[PDB]
């Protein structure tokens, strides 16, 4: 029925260009391999884009934006047809317009456009589209905001380039909003595209923690919905990523007991992305991994290094060994970690983890014994270690290939067991 | 130290199809 189809949206007449409009859009509305390339083949995707113009009729250019918004859901290859055709000003004309239904199906094909790759990602924001698209989320619609959400995260979405942060940081007020939201999928995506916003430098990070949103984020991890706690949790793990004094605005906004809510998840990755981010504030100073413990958050932690899953118990690692740093500074943070039974579960993971883990996991292990040297000028974390079968996977590192968990290996061996 | 577990960048397609 293509032939016929064609020509009839080539008819001078209106009514029946809108027919032949809405007959593609229908076809290539399947959720499984819409006829893509023999529409493209047709010829017709110029034609369509024509149909988008300035003063055609509200529902051709409605119907013309879907038919283009699925072309452009398929493929790269596909996508760039539509790309190449010119449609991209056009979508983001039709975002002027006063029609709510014209403008949602803009901004969704200029949610699959940017969504493919970061050129047409980048292509979108050099074509101006960042204002009109911030001044969608004055709408009486909750799914025009809805989509034009999921849009503004593609726009910020992708490292390999970052996208100019000249642009995508003026949606940072707008996304502060954003997680207000009482609709759950603007707030998953609002979530998302923060998490992209805030996946980059501390310059990056600073303007997040500017326009306030940390703290409805925290608010946000004890979420009904996973959907939920997955992308705010990744923004939060994000952040912390950062500086000391940025760090310690997200443990000032009530993370710390919202983590060890989140350490008894079902979803493990959501586990592991908690102890992950506990492990960037342990990462800190003594005041922040005192804050944890004051948290209650070792005892859950070193049961995840005990039980859980390895690249959950990796993080779990992470955090209980970044925590032992403080030992130098406040030996009651290497004796409260032993006494929580954290001894153990390093030691063996001496002979399972990969070659950063066994570092990480004999940084945590040499401070236990600094400290337990030190509280005798003042070892019986020596004696915990090696009951725990510690001495022996500590001696056989001493065959590690690499250079510096050997040498660790040794000093260890050579120090503390002498 | 500070670490991210991920590193891989992948740009994998994000669109969606409306039906």
């Given amino acids: ?418 | 130290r500070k670490h991210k577990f991920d590193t891989s960048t992948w740009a994998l397609p994000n669109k969606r199809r409306r039906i």
């Avoid at chain 1, 949610?111 to 790759?117: K, L, P």
């Avoid at chain 1, 805030?198 to 703290?215: F, N, T």
């Fill in chain 1, 1 to 418: 029925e293509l032939p016929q189809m064609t020509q009839q949206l080539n008819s001078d007449d209106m009514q029946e260009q809108l027919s032949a409009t809405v007959k593609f859009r229908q076809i290539l509305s399947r959720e499984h391999r819409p006829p893509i390339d023999v529409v493209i083949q047709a010829g017709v995707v110029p034609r369509l884009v024509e149909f988008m113009r300035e003063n055609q009729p509200e529902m051709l250019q409605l119907e013309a934006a879907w038919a283009l918004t699925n072309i452009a859901s398929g493929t790269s290859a596909q996508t760039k047809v539509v790309v190449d055709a010119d449609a991209v000003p056009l979508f983001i004309q039709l975002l002027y317009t006063g029609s709510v239904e014209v403008k949602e199906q803009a901004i969704w094909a200029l949610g699959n456009v940017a969504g493919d790759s970061t050129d047409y990602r980048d292509y979108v924001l050099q074509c101006n589209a960042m204002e009109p698209i911030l001044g969608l989320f004055n709408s009486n619609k909750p799914s025009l905001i809805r989509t034009a959400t999921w849009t503004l995260s593609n726009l910020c979405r992708g490292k390999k380039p970052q996208p100019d942060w000249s642009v995508v940081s003026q949606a940072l007020p707008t996304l502060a909003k954003l997680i207000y939201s009482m609709d759950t999928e603007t707030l998953v995506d609002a979530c998302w595209a923060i998490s992209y916003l805030s996946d980059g430098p501390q310059e990056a990070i600073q303007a997040v923690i500017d326009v306030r949103i940390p703290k409805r984020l925290v608010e946000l991890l004890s979420h009904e919905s996973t959907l939920v706690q997955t992308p705010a949790l990744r923004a939060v793990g994000n952040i912390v990523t950062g500086n000391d004094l940025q760090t310690q605005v997200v443990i000032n906004a009530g993370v710390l007991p919202a983590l060890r809510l989140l350490l008894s998840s079902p979803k493990e990755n959501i586990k592991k992305e908690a102890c992950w981010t506990i492990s960037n504030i342990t990462a800190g100073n003594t005041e922040q991994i005192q804050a944890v413990i004051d948290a209650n958050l070792i005892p859950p932690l070193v049961k995840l290094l005990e039980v859980a899953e390895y690249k959950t118990k990796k993080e779990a690692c992470w955090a209980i060994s970044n925590a032992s740093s403080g030992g130098l500074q406040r030996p009651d943070i290497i004796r409260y970690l032993v006494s929580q039974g954290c001894i153990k579960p390093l030691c063996d993971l001496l002979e399972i983890a990969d070659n950063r883990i066994i570092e990480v996991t004999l940084d945590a292990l040499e401070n236990i014994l600094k400290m337990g040297e030190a509280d005798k000028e003042a070892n019986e974390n020596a004696d915990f270690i090696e009951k725990a079968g510690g001495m022996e996977k500590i001696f056989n590192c001493q065959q590690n290939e690499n250079d510096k968990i050997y040498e660790k290996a040794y000093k260890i061996i050579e120090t503390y067991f002498g």
